[model samples]
Target: GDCLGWFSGCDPNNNKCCEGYVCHWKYPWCRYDL
Candidate 1:
């Protein structure tokens, strides 16, 4: 998925992504859970 503009490291408990998107832990990025 894309990095969604925001930038951050691996973290499950963070609000880096926008609404409806989640911070992908595997790769520092934001994406919708598919």
Candidate 2:
């Protein structure tokens, strides 16, 4: 899926989510807060 990326839960300290996305550990996916 395009909403997913590297491991580490993709957090502020970890930019696994990409440029315009963040790691949502709950679902473990990189998605935007709409």
Candidate 3:
């Protein structure tokens, strides 16, 4: 997948990052839910 580097949750079973400047990426990005 292309997560954790440019995106997150690229699939349906990945990307579980927490609060920080790393989780928030873009609209179709990481777990922006703090």
Candidate 4:
């Protein structure tokens, strides 16, 4: 599975991805209103 490094080091319990980002099956990429 490929993942974005930005989210790899994040705590599952805590929000590690920056704002406007979410953890999903397609992790590493953040979902935005755009």
Model 3 agreement with the true structure over 4-28: per-residue lDDT tens digits? 5434443224444444414333444
How are the candidates ranked when ordered by TM-score, highest leading? 1, 2, 4, 3
lDDT of 1 by residue, 1-34 (tens): 6544444443467655555666666666655666
TM-score of 1: 0.36
Regions of model 3 farther than 4 Å from truth: 1-9, 16-28
Residues 1-34, model 4: lDDT tens digits = 4443453554444545665556554443444424
lDDT of each: 0.56, 0.55, 0.40, 0.48
In angstroms, the error of model 1 at 29 is 1.3
Off by over 4 Å in 4: 1-14, 25-33
Give candidates' CA RMSD values in order: 5.4, 5.1, 6.4, 6.9
Best by TM-score: 1
Q: What TM-score against the true fold does each predicted structure earn?
A: 0.36, 0.34, 0.19, 0.29
Q: In model 1, how large is the Cα lDDT of residue 23?
A: 65
lDDT tens per residue, model 2, 1-34: 5534544356555555656666655555566656
lDDT of 2 at 9: 55
Error of 3 at 5 (Å): 5.1
* Model 3 weakest lDDT span, ten residues long: 19-28
Instruction: lDDT for model 4, please.
Output: 0.48
Better of 1 and 4 by TM-score: 1
* lDDT of predicted model 3: 0.40
Residue 18 of model 2, lDDT score: 50
Off by over 4 Å in 2: 1-15
